[PDB]
Amino acid sequence: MSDTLTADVIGRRVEVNGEHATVRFAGVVPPVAGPWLGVEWDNPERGKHDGSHEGTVYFKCRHPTGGSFIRPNKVNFGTDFLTAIKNR
């Protein structure tokens, strides 16, 4: 628990809308000046695009229609073992 954010945001399993997704990219994007993170969903039906547009690849994924963009607010890293046991 610290105010400083970890630089290893890429590769973390996040929870959004009750679905577990995998982070593939953690940087800023050209069109928006907000923190946008690329997430691949377990079910490709919830995706949007492969993660590349105009021939330029931003973040790779295993499914041609499983990657999407979100913000840290919608991301829910969840608690840990002891904290989860205490809350349950």
Q: How far is CA 77 from CA 12, 16, 70, in A?
A: 8, 9, 13
Task: Note the resolution in Å, 1 decimal.
Answer: 2.2
DSSP secondary-structure letter at 76? B
Q: How far is CA 39 from CA 14, 16, 19, 83, in A?
A: 8, 10, 11, 25
DSSP-derived secondary structure for 23-66 = EEEEEE-SS--SEEEEEEESSGGG--B-SEETTEESS--SSTT-
